[PDB]
Amino acid sequence: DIYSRLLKARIVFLVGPVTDESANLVVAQLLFLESANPDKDIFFYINSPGGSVTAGMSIYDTMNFIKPDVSTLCLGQAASMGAFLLSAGEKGKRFALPNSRIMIHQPLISGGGQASDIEIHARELLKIKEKLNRLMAKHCDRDLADLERDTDRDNFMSAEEAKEYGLIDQILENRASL
Amino acid sequence: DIYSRLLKARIVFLVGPVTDESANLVVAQLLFLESANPDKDIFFYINSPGGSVTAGMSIYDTMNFIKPDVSTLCLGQAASMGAFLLSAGEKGKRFALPNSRIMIHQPLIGQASDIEIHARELLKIKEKLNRLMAKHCDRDLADLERDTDRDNFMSAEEAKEYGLIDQILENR
Amino acid sequence: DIYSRLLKARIVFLVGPVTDESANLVVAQLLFLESANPDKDIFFYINSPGGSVTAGMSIYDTMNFIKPDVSTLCLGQAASMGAFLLSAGEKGKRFALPNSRIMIHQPLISGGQASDIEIHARELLKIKEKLNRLMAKHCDRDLADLERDTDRDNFMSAEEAKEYGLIDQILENRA
Amino acid sequence: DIYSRLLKARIVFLVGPVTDESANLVVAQLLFLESANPDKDIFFYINSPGGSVTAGMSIYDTMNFIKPDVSTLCLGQAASMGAFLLSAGEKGKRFALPNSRIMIHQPLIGGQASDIEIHARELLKIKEKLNRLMAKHCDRDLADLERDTDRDNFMSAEEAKEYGLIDQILENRASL
Amino acid sequence: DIYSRLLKARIVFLVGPVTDESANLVVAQLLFLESANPDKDIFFYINSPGGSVTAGMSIYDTMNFIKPDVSTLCLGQAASMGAFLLSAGEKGKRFALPNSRIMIHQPLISLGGQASDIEIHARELLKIKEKLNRLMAKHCDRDLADLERDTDRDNFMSAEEAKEYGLIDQILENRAS
Amino acid sequence: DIYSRLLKARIVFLVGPVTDESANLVVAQLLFLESANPDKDIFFYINSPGGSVTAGMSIYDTMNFIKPDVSTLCLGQAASMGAFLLSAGEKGKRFALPNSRIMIHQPLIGGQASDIEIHARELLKIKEKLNRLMAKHCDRDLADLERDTDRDNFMSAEEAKEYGLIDQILENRAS
Amino acid sequence: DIYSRLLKARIVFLVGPVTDESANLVVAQLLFLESANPDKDIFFYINSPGGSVTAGMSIYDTMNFIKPDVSTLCLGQAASMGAFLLSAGEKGKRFALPNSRIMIHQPLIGGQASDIEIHARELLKIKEKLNRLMAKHCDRDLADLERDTDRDNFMSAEEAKEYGLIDQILENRA
Amino acid sequence: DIYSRLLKARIVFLVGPVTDESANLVVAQLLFLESANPDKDIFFYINSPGGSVTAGMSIYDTMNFIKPDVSTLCLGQAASMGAFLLSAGEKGKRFALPNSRIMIHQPLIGGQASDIEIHARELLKIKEKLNRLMAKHCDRDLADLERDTDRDNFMSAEEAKEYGLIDQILENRASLRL
Amino acid sequence: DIYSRLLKARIVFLVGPVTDESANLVVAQLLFLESANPDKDIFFYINSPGGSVTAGMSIYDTMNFIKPDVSTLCLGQAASMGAFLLSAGEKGKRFALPNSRIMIHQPLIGGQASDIEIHARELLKIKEKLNRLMAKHCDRDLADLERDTDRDNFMSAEEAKEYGLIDQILENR
Amino acid sequence: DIYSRLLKARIVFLVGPVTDESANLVVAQLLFLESANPDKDIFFYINSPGGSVTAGMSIYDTMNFIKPDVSTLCLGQAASMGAFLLSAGEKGKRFALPNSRIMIHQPLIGQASDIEIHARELLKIKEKLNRLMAKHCDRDLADLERDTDRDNFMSAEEAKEYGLIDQILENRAS
Amino acid sequence: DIYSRLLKARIVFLVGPVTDESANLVVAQLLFLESANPDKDIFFYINSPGGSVTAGMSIYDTMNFIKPDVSTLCLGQAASMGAFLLSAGEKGKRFALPNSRIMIHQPLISGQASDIEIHARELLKIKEKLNRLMAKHCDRDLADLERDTDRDNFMSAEEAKEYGLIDQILENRA
């Protein structure tokens, strides 16, 4: 099948929503490629609207844990945890295609309990919000305060804007673009 | 109809869940009875599992606002906002029938910013209800915080000993 | 309407499941009839499979609170809280029609954290104990008899309910 | 309304399924008519497929309890508890219209085996009780009713008369 | 019925969501009471989470159009268009009960069509947002910029906070003004 | 009831979607008020998002048919057929409250191509007819209405006045 | 209520789909008004998209059966059985308001082939019968109605007048 | 299977709605064929009503990024993003079959006004970007594309050719001109 | 699998509704068979009630585009786009089995009037275009096809032959 | 397939809710790896919100039953039975990635007699899990009772200090 | 796949509800393993809440019918027919893991009176039959099983051992 053939070239895809099962499949491929050759770059192609924060963190920590550089490429879009993961590729090896789009924003829950429980989960959500802003600020070499303002609502960026923001390093128009 | 007739004896019922529409109907009857005679007691009979906090507050503030004493009587049960309203009747005129049951507990139910705002509001409500309940029961705020952390069921006697009602009525 | 006319004769009906709304309507009629005449019997006719325990208690406590004797009559059936209320009429004035049926049983839930489940399980067992004690009182029987006889659904004919102490007499006609 | 007006003439209807609400409404009318005049017949018109056994018993016991004779008339059909109630009218005053139909049959309906045992035994008690009462209504042997209610047993007006379930078939008021 | 009786005392209720139906019923009562006596105050009691903006405006404009002063009273809550209408009562006659709650916020849609259509409706929504902030600023005697800042997200106020904000005039515990 | 009472004052309401049922109820009130007094104005209060075109036309033609002037007042909103009817009140007696909103637009909604052709042809006839009638109501060029109804066109009270859709904005009874 | 009040003026409404219950309510009012005064016109106001053919026929036959002239008025629309009933008012007393719309068309709708044959024939009989009656109402040739009802045929008030379906368009009380 | 065999002839299909999954499968095949032979044309056959704009952009940017010319062929229809991708094939190698149909139009689709403003502006950015890119593909004025995409614009194969959207109509294996 | 085996004999099936997926699978097989041997006939067997017009056109244009003659055979039925495709086989090589049935008819299917106008015009163009192409396939007058497709027009195999839609009825070989 | 490949490196995954089916698949892999080589560590990677208590116990008892050390690694999250299983890896070989999250809490969700029986059983489970967790964390039973009364979220460092894991791994260091 | 491989070690799993199809799959594996080697033990691992009584009996009778000893192991839980099957393994070779749970209880289900009588009788026959067979499995009195299955009876591994339902609790190999 085509995706197994591209895995031979060290290409891993994240396509569609980030779930436990789609994130772990990425984690598995990353571990596989490291085992096959710990000294060669991995190319992580991302076309995703985001999804589960903890599922994305499992990918994130695996990216940082393995020895190979994980280069990231945004095709189509990288939004929310998708953009987080894109910004997390090896600095200098984070790319987007020219008509890609990036979007960043604060955490978002959809859809209970006693006030005590709501307090506990609201505090956890705000911890997540602060943690993601600090990590994103480091990825972008920007101030924490910049990320806090810029993620208050949905923030759409062109490839060029994401580059200028520090989220990616280079826009690739073709192979000559390097 | 039977409820209109009992209204002429100054009996008002809260039965079932407290909603905007059931609470306002109570408010309307309270205002009506005050207008009919501002110097005679009102008998507020409560058999309710609770419901909307803001709807209950509309009843609560109306009870305290009008001139007549509002005497409360728990029949069947008064739980959550139901128990709050029972505890809010004119002190000395808060009653339960012998096999009534009372239950008190803490409040129960977008972007992180919005969740923070609503979580804060919910905790304000929790603290406000504990402070008002402590006043109703002549108890320490810390007692109510302790005793509403989870569902706290009380017999009529336990509610009396707690300060939530004044006396248990077997018969007249 | 027919039920308002029978209310003139001091007849109150409980028909179908006991809910907050159906129980409070009974409570309202009981209070109304007491106000109309506190010295005349009320006839509480019961054809019910039961329902909410707290709703039934509101009827129960009102029955005991008002000054008129509340006579009870089982027609069709009085099951669960229905049978509880039947057994609660003024002793000597609790009746059933000859082909009525009675059924008694322990509490039954149709529908959180372990801590919360513990709290509600303890409340349910309190209710179970309380209903058995009150029923034993109504039937002039031992608490232990009611515990054993309500462990599962216990169906009684009119004649068995009389012998149990749940009702006083079976009425076949107006004699 | 038309039904209140016919109640003036001491006509009570049971139409459609017997439920707690429909049965109690009949009970209420029976008690009302007895109070209005305890010495005049009541005419109980039945077009019903049956329904709840306990709800039907509440009607049945009320019919036997009040002072007035309750005359029964089957129009359209009287099936199951409907036929039971028809057969229960004052003997000599149980009628059907010529194209009425009657049907009788045995009772027709989860948890632990213990509970299923309890409810199965109650259902069989009901079955035997209804057969005993029906046999008395029809002046027939218990064993005849057991035999004849094992499955759905449809009867014409003539067959119900010959069975003992009704007394007469009325084509117009001149029959009696 | 009880509400008709209270209408004779010139009490009008808004309870629950503001819809075309519920708003017009209020409008009808306001017009009725003005006709019955154009020189006596009307008491508009509000326990509402809000609802349709255009339906609320029909109430609002009627309140300002009729001759009687419309006094407002918040019981339970007045949120969104509910709070707008509360703030719109005759200045000096806007009240809340002590445990009432007020909430204000910017408009909220729960959009389909062509980009051109989405542009048209997004503009209209932003017009509504500015219009409500300017009217609210006038009701509260506050700067437009204060209302813009304070309605960006859900802003819950106690009765005392609503009084200090300028949204109501007094808190009534019992009749002692 | 309150609406019957306001009908004595010759006030008729259109609230919510225009349907056959809601439109005919308006028609009935208009005919009733004309019969009661053919020489006194009728006050038609409109808070509506629109609805059925044929149902609105039944109101429209009745407004023009009866002897009384029908004055219109927009409260809350008058959109689509709602705005059409508002614009159709007796010229000089068409009003809006200050925060009312008006919206106008072109018509908005299966089988064989032949049938789709027939119904598409009818819809375009309706579109022209409404633009021609609206242009007459607003004393504007047909071409202005064609251009201005191509997509949803929201107007404040003052914009609707300038457009010719209403005559005056009423803040209170001064004005 | 308002409709009872207008019934005193001999105004009867058909609004919305023609069903057994809405048609019989019209029939009842027609019989009532005839009993109240058999010598005064009845004004039958029609705003309807059509509906059940047999329900419409019950109205139709009642219109022709009672002594009073039944004048018809189309407001909003009269489509299908609605237009049939409009065309059926007393000739000379069939009206439409200026922006009314009329639409006419042929009839529009499981088992064994034998049963499908039976019901298909009945439907074609109905189609034939309605075209014949409509042609009489409009003083037109049967063949014109067959041609003109093959698909949905929308008419303005003026087109319905030239077609023969109504007699006069009323703008006002002048 | 048949599609794998046609892939060895360098034929890639886009059939039905453009989704993240269907677009990425195309991207994968394009990358595969480039790897197999970077100097041979790819034949991208399109029968699609359109779909996700970001998913289509991932295909678009990949088409422009790889070394091989991507020739496009419209069979059945190419509507919306389908027509965008058709118009994006290597100029001179964009084809349609004689009874193909093309349709172009502007983009087509909850929360606080602030959020609705953000997403409305992003949608209008997309609308302008697609009109600019389409104008470039068709060698036409931006103002022509704005005018011609305001509502659904259906084109026959010859109309699409005259518009500049395709280069030639192929009736058979003859048909090709310079 | 059986269909792959029959593909070796150059047999392609269209069965059931014509969709983008089912039409493109046919297109793919046609291209495959042309590549395997551009000089041998293809046998296109059709049992279909029709479906998407644009999906059918993709098959149609591919049939005309490839070198091999595409012979068509109607088994069971060829209705709407199914009958269109049957009529489109290489003239002289369009067949039906004796109890096959053919049906032809005109095209059969929300928003602003402007949009409804646009789509109604497109639908009538399609109707026009299909009648013209069908008239050519059948060597008949455009006006005949307009009249004969106004409503559902069912044909036996011999009626379809007489109409010009197929060339011969095959009882056996 | 990729997971079979990683199994050859002795990596077993628990991803998503713990069910009978997902737990037994883990049990099967554990038994398989023990059979393949009883003397080599197994690496149990956990990204799970929890699930069935009895299903988790089947994994737990299998972890303790087989001869190989089962090393655990939390990636993404280990909540409820997920955190229980993480805390149950061979002491000294329990790891989390730096942005992992852990959450622990008490257990979560007929006739009165039956409700009593099941409430009993649930409280037994609650005490048993607190006892076992206290052992895993080398903490007092009373600490676990206090700390699981409501949802208790921990960072990787908090879980380490709590005793739930041994080391946080940033990378292929140590 | 992993389960086929474990089958080669003579391990058979029952996981989740006992249905006709899950029970027959077990029966098939038992017959297969007997054919492969009739003289070697089979290891039947059970993590099940129970299910169909007749489906469980098909497993039960197959266990007793084949020549190999069927050793049973409870992991996670063995409830109702699950516990029945666990108790049915070769005496001396019935095991549970330390945190396994067992539950036993009487039968539980979720027409005309005649038919209800017939099925109620059959259900009570099943109830007595299961109590007799269970009493034999546990070497206990019939009257003990009747008393102890009246309502849901949860047992720890040690309680199940003391009851006679299993022979040994296995931590690791012990």
Automatic annotation (TrEMBL), chain B:
<protein>
    <recommendedName>
        <fullName>ATP-dependent Clp protease proteolytic subunit</fullName>
        <ecNumber>3.4.21.92</ecNumber>
    </recommendedName>
</protein>
<dbReference type="Pfam" id="PF00574">
    <property type="entry name" value="CLP_protease"/>
</dbReference>
<keyword id="KW-0720">Serine protease</keyword>
<dbReference type="GO" id="GO:0005737">
    <property type="term" value="C:cytoplasm"/>
</dbReference>
<dbReference type="GO" id="GO:0004176">
    <property type="term" value="F:ATP-dependent peptidase activity"/>
</dbReference>
<comment type="subunit">
    <text>Fourteen ClpP subunits assemble into 2 heptameric rings which stack back to back to give a disk-like structure with a central cavity, resembling the structure of eukaryotic proteasomes.</text>
</comment>
<keyword id="KW-0645">Protease</keyword>
<comment type="function">
    <text>Cleaves peptides in various proteins in a process that requires ATP hydrolysis. Has a chymotrypsin-like activity. Plays a major role in the degradation of misfolded proteins.</text>
</comment>
<keyword id="KW-0963">Cytoplasm</keyword>
<feature type="active site" description="Nucleophile">
    <location>
        <position position="80"/>
    </location>
</feature>
<keyword id="KW-0378">Hydrolase</keyword>
<dbReference type="GO" id="GO:0006515">
    <property type="term" value="P:protein quality control for misfolded or incompletely synthesized proteins"/>
</dbReference>
From TrEMBL, chain D:
<dbReference type="InterPro" id="IPR029045">
    <property type="entry name" value="ClpP/crotonase-like_dom_sf"/>
</dbReference>
<comment type="function">
    <text>Cleaves peptides in various proteins in a process that requires ATP hydrolysis. Has a chymotrypsin-like activity. Plays a major role in the degradation of misfolded proteins.</text>
</comment>
<dbReference type="GO" id="GO:0006515">
    <property type="term" value="P:protein quality control for misfolded or incompletely synthesized proteins"/>
</dbReference>
<dbReference type="GO" id="GO:0051117">
    <property type="term" value="F:ATPase binding"/>
</dbReference>
<feature type="active site">
    <location>
        <position position="105"/>
    </location>
</feature>
<feature type="active site" description="Nucleophile">
    <location>
        <position position="80"/>
    </location>
</feature>
<keyword id="KW-0720">Serine protease</keyword>
<keyword id="KW-0645">Protease</keyword>
<comment type="similarity">
    <text>Belongs to the peptidase S14 family.</text>
</comment>
<feature type="active site">
    <location>
        <position position="80"/>
    </location>
</feature>
<keyword id="KW-0963">Cytoplasm</keyword>
<dbReference type="GO" id="GO:0009368">
    <property type="term" value="C:endopeptidase Clp complex"/>
</dbReference>
TrEMBL record, chain E:
<feature type="active site">
    <location>
        <position position="80"/>
    </location>
</feature>
<dbReference type="InterPro" id="IPR018215">
    <property type="entry name" value="ClpP_Ser_AS"/>
</dbReference>
<dbReference type="InterPro" id="IPR001907">
    <property type="entry name" value="ClpP"/>
</dbReference>
<dbReference type="GO" id="GO:0006515">
    <property type="term" value="P:protein quality control for misfolded or incompletely synthesized proteins"/>
</dbReference>
<dbReference type="GO" id="GO:0004252">
    <property type="term" value="F:serine-type endopeptidase activity"/>
</dbReference>
<dbReference type="InterPro" id="IPR033135">
    <property type="entry name" value="ClpP_His_AS"/>
</dbReference>
<dbReference type="GO" id="GO:0005737">
    <property type="term" value="C:cytoplasm"/>
</dbReference>
<keyword id="KW-0720">Serine protease</keyword>
<dbReference type="InterPro" id="IPR029045">
    <property type="entry name" value="ClpP/crotonase-like_dom_sf"/>
</dbReference>
<comment type="function">
    <text>Cleaves peptides in various proteins in a process that requires ATP hydrolysis. Has a chymotrypsin-like activity. Plays a major role in the degradation of misfolded proteins.</text>
</comment>
<dbReference type="Pfam" id="PF00574">
    <property type="entry name" value="CLP_protease"/>
</dbReference>
<keyword id="KW-0963">Cytoplasm</keyword>
Automatic annotation (TrEMBL), chain J:
<comment type="function">
    <text>Cleaves peptides in various proteins in a process that requires ATP hydrolysis. Has a chymotrypsin-like activity. Plays a major role in the degradation of misfolded proteins.</text>
</comment>
<comment type="similarity">
    <text>Belongs to the peptidase S14 family.</text>
</comment>
<feature type="active site" description="Nucleophile">
    <location>
        <position position="80"/>
    </location>
</feature>
<dbReference type="GO" id="GO:0004176">
    <property type="term" value="F:ATP-dependent peptidase activity"/>
</dbReference>
<dbReference type="GO" id="GO:0006515">
    <property type="term" value="P:protein quality control for misfolded or incompletely synthesized proteins"/>
</dbReference>
<keyword id="KW-0963">Cytoplasm</keyword>
<dbReference type="GO" id="GO:0009368">
    <property type="term" value="C:endopeptidase Clp complex"/>
</dbReference>
<keyword id="KW-0378">Hydrolase</keyword>
<dbReference type="Pfam" id="PF00574">
    <property type="entry name" value="CLP_protease"/>
</dbReference>
<dbReference type="InterPro" id="IPR033135">
    <property type="entry name" value="ClpP_His_AS"/>
</dbReference>
<keyword id="KW-0645">Protease</keyword>
<dbReference type="InterPro" id="IPR029045">
    <property type="entry name" value="ClpP/crotonase-like_dom_sf"/>
</dbReference>
